[PDB]
mmCIF file of C-alpha atoms in Angstrom:
data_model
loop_
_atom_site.group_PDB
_atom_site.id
_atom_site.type_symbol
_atom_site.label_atom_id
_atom_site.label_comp_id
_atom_site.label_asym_id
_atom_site.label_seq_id
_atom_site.Cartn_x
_atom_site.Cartn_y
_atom_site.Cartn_z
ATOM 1 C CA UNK A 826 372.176 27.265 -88.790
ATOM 2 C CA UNK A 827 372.240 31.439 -88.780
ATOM 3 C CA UNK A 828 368.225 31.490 -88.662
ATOM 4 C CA UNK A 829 368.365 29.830 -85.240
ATOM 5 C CA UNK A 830 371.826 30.595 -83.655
ATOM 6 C CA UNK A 831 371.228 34.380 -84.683
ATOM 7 C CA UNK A 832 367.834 34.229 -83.128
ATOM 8 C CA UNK A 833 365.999 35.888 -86.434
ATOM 9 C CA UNK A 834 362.290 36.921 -85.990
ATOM 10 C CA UNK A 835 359.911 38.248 -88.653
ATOM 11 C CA UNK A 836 357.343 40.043 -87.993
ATOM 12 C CA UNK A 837 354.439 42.180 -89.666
ATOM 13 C CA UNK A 838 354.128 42.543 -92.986
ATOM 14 C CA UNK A 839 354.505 44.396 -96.379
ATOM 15 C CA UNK A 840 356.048 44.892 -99.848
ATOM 16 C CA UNK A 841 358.463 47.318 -98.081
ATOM 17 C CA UNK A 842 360.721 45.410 -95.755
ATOM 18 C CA UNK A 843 363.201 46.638 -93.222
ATOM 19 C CA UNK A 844 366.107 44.981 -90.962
ATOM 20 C CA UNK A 845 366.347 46.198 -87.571
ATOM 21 C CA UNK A 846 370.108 45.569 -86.265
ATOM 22 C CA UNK A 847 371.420 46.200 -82.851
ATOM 23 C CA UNK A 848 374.837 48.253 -81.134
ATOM 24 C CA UNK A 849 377.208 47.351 -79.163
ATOM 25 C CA UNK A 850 376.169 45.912 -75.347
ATOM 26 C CA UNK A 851 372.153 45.463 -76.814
ATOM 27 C CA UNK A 852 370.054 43.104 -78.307
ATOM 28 C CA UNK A 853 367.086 42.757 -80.787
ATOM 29 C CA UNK A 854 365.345 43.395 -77.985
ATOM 30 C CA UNK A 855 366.362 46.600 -77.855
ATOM 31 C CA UNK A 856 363.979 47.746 -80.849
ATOM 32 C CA UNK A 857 360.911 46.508 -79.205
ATOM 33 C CA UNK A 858 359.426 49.603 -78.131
ATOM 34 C CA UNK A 859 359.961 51.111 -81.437
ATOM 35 C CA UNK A 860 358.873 48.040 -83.440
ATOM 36 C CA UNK A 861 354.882 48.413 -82.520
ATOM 37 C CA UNK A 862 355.362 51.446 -84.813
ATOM 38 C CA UNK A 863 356.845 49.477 -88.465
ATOM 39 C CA UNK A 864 354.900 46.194 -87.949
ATOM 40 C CA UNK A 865 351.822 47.250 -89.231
ATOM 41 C CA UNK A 866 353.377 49.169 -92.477
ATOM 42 C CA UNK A 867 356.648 46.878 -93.506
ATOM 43 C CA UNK A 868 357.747 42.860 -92.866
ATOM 44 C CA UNK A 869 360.149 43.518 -90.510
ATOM 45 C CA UNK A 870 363.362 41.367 -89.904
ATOM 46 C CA UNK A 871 365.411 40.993 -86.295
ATOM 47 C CA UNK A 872 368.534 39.296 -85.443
ATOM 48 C CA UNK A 873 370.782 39.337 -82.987
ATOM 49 C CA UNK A 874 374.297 39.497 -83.493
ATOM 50 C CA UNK A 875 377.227 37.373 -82.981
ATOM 51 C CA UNK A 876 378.107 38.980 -79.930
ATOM 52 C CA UNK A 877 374.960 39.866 -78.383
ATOM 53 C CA UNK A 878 374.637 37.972 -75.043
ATOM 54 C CA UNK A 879 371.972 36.452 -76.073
ATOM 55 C CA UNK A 880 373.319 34.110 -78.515
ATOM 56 C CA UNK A 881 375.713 31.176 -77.327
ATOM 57 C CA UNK A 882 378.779 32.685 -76.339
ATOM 58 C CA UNK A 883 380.378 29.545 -77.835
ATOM 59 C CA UNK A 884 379.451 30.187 -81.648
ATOM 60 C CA UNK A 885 381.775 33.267 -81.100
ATOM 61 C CA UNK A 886 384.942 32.544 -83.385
ATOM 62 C CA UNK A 887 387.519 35.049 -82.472
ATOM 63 C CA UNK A 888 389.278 34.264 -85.545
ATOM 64 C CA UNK A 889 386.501 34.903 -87.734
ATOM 65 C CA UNK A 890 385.320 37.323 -85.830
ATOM 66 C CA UNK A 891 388.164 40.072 -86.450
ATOM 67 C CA UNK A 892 386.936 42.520 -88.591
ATOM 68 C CA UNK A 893 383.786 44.138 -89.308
ATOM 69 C CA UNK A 894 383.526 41.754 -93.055
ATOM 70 C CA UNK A 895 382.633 38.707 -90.773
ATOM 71 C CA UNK A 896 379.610 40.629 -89.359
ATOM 72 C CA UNK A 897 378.396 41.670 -93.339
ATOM 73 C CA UNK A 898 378.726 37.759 -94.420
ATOM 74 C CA UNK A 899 376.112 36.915 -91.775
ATOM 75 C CA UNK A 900 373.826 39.458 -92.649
ATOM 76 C CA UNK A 901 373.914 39.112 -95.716
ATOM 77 C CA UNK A 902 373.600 35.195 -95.347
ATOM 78 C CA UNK A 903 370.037 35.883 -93.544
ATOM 79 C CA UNK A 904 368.703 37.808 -96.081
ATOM 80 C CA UNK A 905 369.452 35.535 -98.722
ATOM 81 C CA UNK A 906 368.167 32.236 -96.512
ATOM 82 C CA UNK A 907 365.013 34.385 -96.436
ATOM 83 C CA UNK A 908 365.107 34.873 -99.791
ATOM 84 C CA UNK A 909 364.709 38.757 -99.519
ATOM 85 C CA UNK A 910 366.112 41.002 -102.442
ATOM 86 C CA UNK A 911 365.496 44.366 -101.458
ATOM 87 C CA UNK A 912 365.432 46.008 -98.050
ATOM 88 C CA UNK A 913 366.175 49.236 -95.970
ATOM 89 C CA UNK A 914 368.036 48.845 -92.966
ATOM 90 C CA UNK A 915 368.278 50.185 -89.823
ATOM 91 C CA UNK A 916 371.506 50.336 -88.059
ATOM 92 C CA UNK A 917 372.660 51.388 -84.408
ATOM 93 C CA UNK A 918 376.406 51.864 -84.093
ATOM 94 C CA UNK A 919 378.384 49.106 -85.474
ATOM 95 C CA UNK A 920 375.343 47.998 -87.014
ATOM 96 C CA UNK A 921 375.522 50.879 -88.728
ATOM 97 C CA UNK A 922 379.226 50.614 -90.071
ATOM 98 C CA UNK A 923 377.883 46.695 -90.756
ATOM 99 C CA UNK A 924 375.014 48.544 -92.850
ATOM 100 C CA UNK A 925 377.263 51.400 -94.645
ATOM 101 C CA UNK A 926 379.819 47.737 -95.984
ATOM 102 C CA UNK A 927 377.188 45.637 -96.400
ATOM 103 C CA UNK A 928 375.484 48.387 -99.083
ATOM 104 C CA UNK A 929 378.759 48.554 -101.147
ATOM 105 C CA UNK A 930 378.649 44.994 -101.394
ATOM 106 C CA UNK A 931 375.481 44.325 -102.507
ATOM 107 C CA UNK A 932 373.770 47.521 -103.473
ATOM 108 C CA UNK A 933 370.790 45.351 -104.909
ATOM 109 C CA UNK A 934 369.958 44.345 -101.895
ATOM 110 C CA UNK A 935 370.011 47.773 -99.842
ATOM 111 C CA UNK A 936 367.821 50.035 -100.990
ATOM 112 C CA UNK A 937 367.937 52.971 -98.262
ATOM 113 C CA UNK A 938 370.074 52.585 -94.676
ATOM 114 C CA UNK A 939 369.184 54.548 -91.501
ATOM 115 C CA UNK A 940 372.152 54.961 -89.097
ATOM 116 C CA UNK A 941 372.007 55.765 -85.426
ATOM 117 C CA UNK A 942 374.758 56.572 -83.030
ATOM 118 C CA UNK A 943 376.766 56.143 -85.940
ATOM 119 C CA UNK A 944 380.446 57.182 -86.696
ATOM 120 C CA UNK A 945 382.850 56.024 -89.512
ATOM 121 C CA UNK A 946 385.717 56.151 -87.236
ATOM 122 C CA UNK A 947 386.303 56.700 -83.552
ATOM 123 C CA UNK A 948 389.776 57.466 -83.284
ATOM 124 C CA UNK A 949 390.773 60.731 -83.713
ATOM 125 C CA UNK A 950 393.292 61.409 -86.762
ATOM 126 C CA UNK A 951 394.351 64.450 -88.425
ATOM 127 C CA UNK A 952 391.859 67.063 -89.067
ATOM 128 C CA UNK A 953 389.373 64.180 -88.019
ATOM 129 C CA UNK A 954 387.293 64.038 -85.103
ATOM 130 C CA UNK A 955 386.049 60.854 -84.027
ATOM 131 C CA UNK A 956 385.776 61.442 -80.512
ATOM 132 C CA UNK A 957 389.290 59.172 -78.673
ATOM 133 C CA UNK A 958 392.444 59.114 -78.284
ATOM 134 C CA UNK A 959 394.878 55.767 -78.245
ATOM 135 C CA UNK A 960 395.667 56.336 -74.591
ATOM 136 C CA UNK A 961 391.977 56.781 -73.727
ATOM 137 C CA UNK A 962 390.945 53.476 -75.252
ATOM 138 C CA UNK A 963 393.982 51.456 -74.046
ATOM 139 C CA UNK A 964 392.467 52.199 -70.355
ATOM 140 C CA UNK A 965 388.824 51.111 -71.510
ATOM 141 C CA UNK A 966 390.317 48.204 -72.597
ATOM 142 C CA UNK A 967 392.703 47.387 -69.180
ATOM 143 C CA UNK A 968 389.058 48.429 -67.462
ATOM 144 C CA UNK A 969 387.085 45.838 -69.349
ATOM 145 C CA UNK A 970 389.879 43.136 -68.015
ATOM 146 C CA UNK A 971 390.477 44.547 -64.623
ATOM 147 C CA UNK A 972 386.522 44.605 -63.686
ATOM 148 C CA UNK A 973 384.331 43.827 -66.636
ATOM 149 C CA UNK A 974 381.026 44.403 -64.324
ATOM 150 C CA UNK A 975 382.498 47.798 -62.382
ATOM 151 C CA UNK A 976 383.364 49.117 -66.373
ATOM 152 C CA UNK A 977 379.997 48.157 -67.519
ATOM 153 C CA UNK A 978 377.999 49.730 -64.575
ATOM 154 C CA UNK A 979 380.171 52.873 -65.260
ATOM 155 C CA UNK A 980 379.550 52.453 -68.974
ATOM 156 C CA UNK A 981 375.674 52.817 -68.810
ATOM 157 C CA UNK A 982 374.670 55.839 -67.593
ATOM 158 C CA UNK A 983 376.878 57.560 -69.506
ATOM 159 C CA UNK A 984 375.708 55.813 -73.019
ATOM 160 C CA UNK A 985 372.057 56.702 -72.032
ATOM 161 C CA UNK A 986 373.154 59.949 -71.347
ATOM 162 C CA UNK A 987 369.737 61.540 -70.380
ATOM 163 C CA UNK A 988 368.766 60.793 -66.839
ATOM 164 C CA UNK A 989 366.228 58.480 -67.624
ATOM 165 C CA UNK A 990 366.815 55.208 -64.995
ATOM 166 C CA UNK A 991 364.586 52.539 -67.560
ATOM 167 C CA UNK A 992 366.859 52.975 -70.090
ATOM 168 C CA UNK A 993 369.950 52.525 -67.866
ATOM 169 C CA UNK A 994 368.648 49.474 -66.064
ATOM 170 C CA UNK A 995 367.698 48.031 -69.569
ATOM 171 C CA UNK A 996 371.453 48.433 -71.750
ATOM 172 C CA UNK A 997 372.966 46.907 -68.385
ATOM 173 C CA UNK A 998 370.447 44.233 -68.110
ATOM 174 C CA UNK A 999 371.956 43.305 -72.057
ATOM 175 C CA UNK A 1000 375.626 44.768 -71.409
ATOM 176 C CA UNK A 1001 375.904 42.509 -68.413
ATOM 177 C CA UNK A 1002 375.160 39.740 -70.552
ATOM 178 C CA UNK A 1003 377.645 39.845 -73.090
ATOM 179 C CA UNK A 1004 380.695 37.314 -72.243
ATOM 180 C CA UNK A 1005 383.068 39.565 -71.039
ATOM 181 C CA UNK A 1006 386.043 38.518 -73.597
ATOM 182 C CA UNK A 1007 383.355 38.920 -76.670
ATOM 183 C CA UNK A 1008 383.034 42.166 -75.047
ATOM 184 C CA UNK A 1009 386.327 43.299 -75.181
ATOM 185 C CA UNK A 1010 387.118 41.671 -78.536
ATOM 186 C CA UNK A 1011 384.463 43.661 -80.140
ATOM 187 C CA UNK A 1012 385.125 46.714 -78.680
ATOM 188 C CA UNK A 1013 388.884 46.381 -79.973
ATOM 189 C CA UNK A 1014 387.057 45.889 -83.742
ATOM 190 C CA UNK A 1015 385.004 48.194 -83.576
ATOM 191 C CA UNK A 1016 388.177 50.946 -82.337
ATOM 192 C CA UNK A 1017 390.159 49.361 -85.441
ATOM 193 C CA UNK A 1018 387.752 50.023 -87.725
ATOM 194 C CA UNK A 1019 387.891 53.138 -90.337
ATOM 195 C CA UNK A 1020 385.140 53.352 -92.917
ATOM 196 C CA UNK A 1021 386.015 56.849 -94.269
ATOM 197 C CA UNK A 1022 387.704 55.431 -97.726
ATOM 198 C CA UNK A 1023 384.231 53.536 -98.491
ATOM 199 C CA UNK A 1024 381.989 56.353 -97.730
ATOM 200 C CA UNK A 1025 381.488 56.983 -101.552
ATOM 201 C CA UNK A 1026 381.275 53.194 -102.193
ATOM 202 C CA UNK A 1027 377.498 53.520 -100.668
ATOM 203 C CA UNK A 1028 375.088 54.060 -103.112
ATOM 204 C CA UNK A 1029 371.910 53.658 -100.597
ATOM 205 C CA UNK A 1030 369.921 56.768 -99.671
ATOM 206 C CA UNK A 1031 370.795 57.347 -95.918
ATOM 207 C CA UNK A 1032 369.018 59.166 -93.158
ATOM 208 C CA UNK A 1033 371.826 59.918 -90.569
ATOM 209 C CA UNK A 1034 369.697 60.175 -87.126
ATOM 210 C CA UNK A 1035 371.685 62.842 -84.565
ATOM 211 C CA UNK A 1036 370.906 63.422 -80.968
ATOM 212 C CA UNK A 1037 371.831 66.648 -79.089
ATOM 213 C CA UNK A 1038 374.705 64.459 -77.456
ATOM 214 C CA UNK A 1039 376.572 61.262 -77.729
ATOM 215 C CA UNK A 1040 379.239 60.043 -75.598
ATOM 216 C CA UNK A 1041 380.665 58.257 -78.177
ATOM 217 C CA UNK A 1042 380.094 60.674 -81.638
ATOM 218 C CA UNK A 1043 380.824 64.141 -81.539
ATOM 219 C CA UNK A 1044 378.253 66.715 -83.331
ATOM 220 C CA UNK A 1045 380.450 67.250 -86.402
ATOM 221 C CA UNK A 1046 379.931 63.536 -87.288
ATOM 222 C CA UNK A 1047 376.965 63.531 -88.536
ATOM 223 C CA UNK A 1048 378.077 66.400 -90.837
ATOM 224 C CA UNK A 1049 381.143 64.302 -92.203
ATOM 225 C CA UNK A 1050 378.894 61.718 -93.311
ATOM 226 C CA UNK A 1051 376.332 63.504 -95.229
ATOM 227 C CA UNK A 1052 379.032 64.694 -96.800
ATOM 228 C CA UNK A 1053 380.985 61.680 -97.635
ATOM 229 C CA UNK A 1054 378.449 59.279 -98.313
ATOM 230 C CA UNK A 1055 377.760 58.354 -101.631
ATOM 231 C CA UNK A 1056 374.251 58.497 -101.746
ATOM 232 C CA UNK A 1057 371.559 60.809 -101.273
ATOM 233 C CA UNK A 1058 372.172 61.325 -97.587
ATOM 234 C CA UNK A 1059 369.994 63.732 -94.983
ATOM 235 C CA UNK A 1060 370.658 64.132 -91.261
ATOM 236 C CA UNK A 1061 367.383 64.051 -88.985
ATOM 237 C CA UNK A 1062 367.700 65.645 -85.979
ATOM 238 C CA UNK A 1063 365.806 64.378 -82.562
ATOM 239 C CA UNK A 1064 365.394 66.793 -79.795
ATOM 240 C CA UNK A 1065 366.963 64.686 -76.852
ATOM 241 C CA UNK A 1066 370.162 63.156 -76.225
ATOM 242 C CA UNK A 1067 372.333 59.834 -76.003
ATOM 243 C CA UNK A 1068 373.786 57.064 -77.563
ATOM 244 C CA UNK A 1069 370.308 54.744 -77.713
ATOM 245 C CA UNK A 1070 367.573 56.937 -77.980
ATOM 246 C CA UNK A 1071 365.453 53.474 -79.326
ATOM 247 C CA UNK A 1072 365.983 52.809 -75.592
ATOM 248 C CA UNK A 1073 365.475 56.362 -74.172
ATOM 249 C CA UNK A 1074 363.512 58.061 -76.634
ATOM 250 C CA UNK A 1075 361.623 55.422 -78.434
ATOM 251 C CA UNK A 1076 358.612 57.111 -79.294
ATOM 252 C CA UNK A 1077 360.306 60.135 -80.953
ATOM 253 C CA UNK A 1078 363.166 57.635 -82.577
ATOM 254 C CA UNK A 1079 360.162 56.052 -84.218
ATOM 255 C CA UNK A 1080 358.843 59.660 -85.983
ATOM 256 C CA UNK A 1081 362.202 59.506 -87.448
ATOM 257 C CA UNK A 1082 361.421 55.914 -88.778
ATOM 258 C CA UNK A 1083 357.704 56.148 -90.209
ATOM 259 C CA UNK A 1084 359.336 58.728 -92.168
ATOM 260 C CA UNK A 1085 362.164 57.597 -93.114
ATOM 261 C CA UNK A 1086 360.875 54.191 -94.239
ATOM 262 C CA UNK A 1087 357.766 55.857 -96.268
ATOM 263 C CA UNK A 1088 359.262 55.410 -99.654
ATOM 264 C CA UNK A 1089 362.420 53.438 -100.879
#
């Protein structure tokens, strides 16, 4: 079942092992320019999720599918069909909040998390910045509806953020992909979603990766979780900007991993 619908790959090898999952609009495919740099050190596990384009639209449950928990079970259902106990894992944007509640359920099993273009909350709230407002979003979502491939060509460019055309052509290659409802429907969960209760939960060691700019988490974010997280948490800066820098700043994105993923 999971092993094949999810698409899971291992690949290199090592005592140390570490989980490489995707953001919103990507793929596993999306680590492969980083990956060349972790194969040779660690065992390395890739999956796609649910909603990537990738998989079968039709193993989507919308049901199911509702809240960020459904993601964790997966996850954590790989890991245990593959009969790994400990891991560090890599997270990019609602993999990230996937990582952060899958480590407060089984702490065991997590022993450090690295989070990229991550954010426990998007909304704004009171004396919180996330980075939207209720109006703001309610227009994404009528724009995902209205013209799914016109919102998703806008959507690009901006999520890249640097000018660097490769990277753009590559998130809309995978963003044009996704089925456009699974699209929406996730992008609803992930807007309803507000981790900043459970920060302490997390016991992991975490590695917060901030660029110099991300359309979708503002600078002080990165601040707010190092100092809500529960565990022994550092922020690593990298000297470009954007939302993906495994897609526009792979080779720098991977300093950040061969050190974060030295010792766990």
């Amino acid at each position: 079942k999971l092993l094949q619908i999810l698409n899971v790959r291992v690949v290199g090898s090592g005592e140390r092992v570490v989980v490489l999952s995707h953001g919103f609009g990507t793929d596993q495919s999306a680590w492969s320019r980083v990956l060349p740099y972790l194969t040779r050190d660690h065992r390395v596990v890739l999956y796609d999720l649910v909603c990537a384009g990738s998989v079968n639209p039709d193993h989507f449950d919308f049901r199911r599918y509702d809240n960020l928990d459904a993601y964790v079970d997966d996850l954590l259902a790989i890991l245990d069909a593959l009969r790994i106990p400990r891991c560090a894992f890599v997270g990019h944007s609602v993999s990230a909040m996937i990582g952060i509640l899958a480590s407060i359920r089984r702490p065991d099993l997590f022993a450090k998390l690295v989070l990229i273009g991550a954010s426990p909350r998007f909304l704004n709230d009171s004396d919180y910045h996330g980075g939207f407002e209720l109006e703001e979003i309610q227009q994404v979502f009528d724009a995902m509806g209205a013209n799914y491939s016109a919102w998703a060509t806008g959507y690009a460019p901006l999520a890249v953020g640097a000018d660097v055309p490769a990277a753009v052509q590559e998130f809309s290659r995978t963003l044009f992909n996704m089925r456009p409802d699974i699209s929406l429907h996730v992008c609803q969960t992930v807007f309803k979603t507000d981790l900043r209760g459970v920060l302490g939960m997390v016991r992991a060691p975490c590695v917060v990766v901030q660029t110099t700019r991300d359309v979708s988490v503002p600078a002080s974010v990165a601040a707010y979780l190092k100092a809500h997280l529960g565990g022994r948490t550092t922020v690593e800066f990298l000297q470009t900007e954007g939302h993906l820098p495994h897609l526009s700043a792979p080779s720098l994105l991977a300093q950040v991993l061969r050190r974060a993923l030295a010792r766990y």
